[PDB]
Amino acid sequence: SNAMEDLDALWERYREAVRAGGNPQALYQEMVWPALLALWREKPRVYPFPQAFAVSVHTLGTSPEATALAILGAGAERVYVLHTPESARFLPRLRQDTGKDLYPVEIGKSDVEAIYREVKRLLEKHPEVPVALDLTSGTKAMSAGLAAAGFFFQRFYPKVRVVYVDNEDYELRRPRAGTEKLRILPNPHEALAEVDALFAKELYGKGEFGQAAAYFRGMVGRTGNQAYALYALLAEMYRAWRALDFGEALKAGRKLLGQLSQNVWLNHPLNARREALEAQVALLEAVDRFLKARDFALKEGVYGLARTLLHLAQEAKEEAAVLAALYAYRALELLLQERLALLGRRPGLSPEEAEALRKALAELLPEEVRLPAKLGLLDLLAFLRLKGDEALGRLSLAELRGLAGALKGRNSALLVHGFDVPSPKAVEGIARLAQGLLQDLEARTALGPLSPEPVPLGF
Amino acid sequence: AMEDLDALWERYREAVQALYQEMVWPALLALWREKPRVYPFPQAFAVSVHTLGTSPEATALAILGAGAERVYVLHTPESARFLPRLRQDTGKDLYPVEIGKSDVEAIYREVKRLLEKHPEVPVALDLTSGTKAMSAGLAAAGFFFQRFYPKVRVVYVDNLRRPRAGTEKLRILPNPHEALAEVDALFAKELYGKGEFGQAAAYFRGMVGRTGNQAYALYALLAEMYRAWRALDFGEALKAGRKLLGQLSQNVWLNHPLNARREALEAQVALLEAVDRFLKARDFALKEGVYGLARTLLHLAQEAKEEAAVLAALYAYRALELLLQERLALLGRRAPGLSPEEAEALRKALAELLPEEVRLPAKLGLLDLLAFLRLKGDEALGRLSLAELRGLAGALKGRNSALLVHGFDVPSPKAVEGIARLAQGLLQDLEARTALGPLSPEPVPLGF
Ligand code: NI
Ligand code: NI
Ligand code: NI
Ligand code: NI
Ligand code: NI
Ligand code: NI
Known part of the structure; x- marks a missing residue:
């Protein structure tokens, strides 16, 4: 590589020219710069x-x-x-x-x-x-x-x-x-590898749990630190939970608690909020089991399911009305069904009851109006309140009549069987009613700390 | 204190580098110490x-x-x-x-x-x-x-x-x-690219507020149309699309980047129009609106397949139901159009598919409707292999059984997948029987 070589020779000649004492600026301009320029012309470094x-x-x-x-x-x-x-x-x-x-x-x-x-x-x-x-x-x-x-x-x-x-400077x-x-x-x-954690934390605060999980998981690969794996598990739990995949949520949470149990992770920040995490995983167990069982005696599973649906409805309430009404309808339906489960049946209708119910419904809205095989939402309200139900008996008639419009429309919504776009006031009425019932059920349930929000990351 | 420094600098230039040190340095220091600038x-x-x-x-x-x-x-x-x-x-x-x-x-x-x-x-x-x-x-x-x-x-x-x-x-x-304020624009584009249409709309709105340019108001209307569309609020989507189209018609905007895609844009808005009609009339004769509703629901199901499988199952179920109901409208029937020889024939068909003592509800379910439409020699459905109808039968029975409608099931991804494929085939068949135009599928590119 002659250009490189005759250039190094020019650098040493330059050394002797400045050792002799010439102004090294011009000696650089004439002795060195054209050879360096040549080296970079032929082969850029x-x-x-x-x-x-x-x-x-x-x-x-x-x-x-x-x-x-x-x-x-x-x-x-x-x-x-x-x-x-x-x-x-x-x-x-x-x-x-x-x-x-x-x-x-x-x-x-x-x-x-x-x-x-x-x-x-x-x-x-x-x-x-x-x-x-x-x-x-x-x-x-x-x-x-x-x-x-x-x-x-x-x-x-x-x-x-x-x-x-x-x-690089090297007399x-x-x-x-x-x-x-x-x-x-x-x-x-x-x-900076670890700065991915910052991004992850940011995404965790805004409820984008899947992306936070992605950042954590990739950080495991890049920095080789397994503590972030735990964070990943946590985010994945909250993802599966928000997606109504309670089995996946429970699985991830159990793996996370089993990791938090080992001595190697005793100082992991997530152990600071260990009580709340065990309460949440307990909720996930109750819901998963109630989904398998369909037994409305397990109040805690009904509670976790309904509360998850109501949270999702409130989050969808402003930017996704149709979705929000779907969520809220399922919540209110579940809660009313657990109310009925407090009584005998799920279908156990005696004719004295059927007649008295046609009376109640008719006086609410014409007694010729007929009643279907499975009980509607307003059907269910009328049957329970007709039996004096404590939380349903407390209902105000002014509210009741205005709800009546929304309660008939449950199967008639765009995303179930019909073409309705929901009235936002109807969505709020359903949601408020559902929330009051959710609170009564919460009172008669054995609950952990009761922390709705996801756990703070601890770093 | 600083005027003193100036006097020192004129005296400096007159007395003219160590003299920069001795003359000037401690007075500059002292100026910065007393009150930093x-x-x-x-x-x-x-x-x-x-x-x-x-x-x-x-x-x-x-x-x-x-x-x-x-x-x-x-x-x-x-x-x-x-x-x-x-x-x-x-x-x-x-x-x-x-x-x-x-x-x-x-x-x-x-x-x-x-x-x-x-x-x-x-x-x-x-x-x-x-x-x-x-x-x-x-x-x-x-x-x-x-x-x-x-x-x-x-x-x-x-x-x-x-x-x-x-x-x-x-x-x-x-x-x-x-x-650079205008870079909030770039942020908008990124959000628009990721599907967060509301935040893109707001960004463009703020840009109109500051810059005073109405082209970004056109961008805001675009993002709002897509946001309302995704939320299945076809009235607001049709509104924003209409207004935007009227603007791109105006001469002041003839060079706006959105016009570079007008042929696509118009088609989509026409689609919204069709859907709105359908939603108001609840009349399955309006094939275009049926196609637009089913296609929106299927796009939503696909985008929710990985992370929101329960929600995706709900979307796909509604799309498939609408498509089968349209197939039924071809034969001039609805939902109660039953005669005993037919009901019994359907009992034998269904039972052969899945034991010949099955109960058929009053109103047909998904599997019931499909088998009934085969019993009437409907074309598109008739070309299903009995094997795949057996493999779809389970997922087709769970229409009201899903967690988000009347039951508690979590979907198997193969079930949502098979229902989405069935609905897809029906959607292509209906696509032949409509005239919806260029109909570019994904949101139009912003053009900058
Ligand atoms: Ni040489
Ligand atoms: Ni990164
Ligand atoms: Ni998001
Ligand atoms: Ni939240
Ligand atoms: Ni239903
Ligand atoms: Ni898409």
């Missing part, structure tokens, strides 16, 4: 891994040489030079040492805002190709602004990379001739 | 972190300017020889931390540790001194961590051959969003 760039953008200040090296090292077809007004005079020489067509763009020395604007415009212009942002030359504000722009815009233009010419108070290397400045997200 | 708007800092390269003076002025009680100095091997002068000029004790000159990841690690140590106080990250990799690294770390430590700020000392002594200003470096 890039690290850590070689890359192809379609576009390169370069801040420019006092030192044209390093920018020339950076242009040659990125090897882009299209080249932009973000330069201060003073350094425009350097652009012909920059054009000559480099042999590229340059696109100059003038920027004030303190104008960081303009750096941001120029990067944004340039990425809108080149949105699908690898782009190199070279911060080597310029004021601290220009270079830091370019790096900050690159890393920020990587979120929307993932082929952007930030680069710079790393020079001769100057970088050694052949040691400069074009490097990629690593993104802080890339370079 | 911080811009654009001053503030207090609890923690200060400084990279240190070859220029200890600017770092001294930065340490004074930030006014922090705890000062961390991130220095190179060489830079250690500057630590006394720093302590002498600032009059502060310093926590030194050694770094390599291009060890950027050690800068990132240090900032991370220091922010874990000080999570709820204003922290100034000063990049004035250091290699390009050190300063760029500190700025990058500051802006990245700002999302999780909002009180972090990045700062720097802003500057004949020397800069005039009184003009140095400790400045706060803005992050890109602070300096």
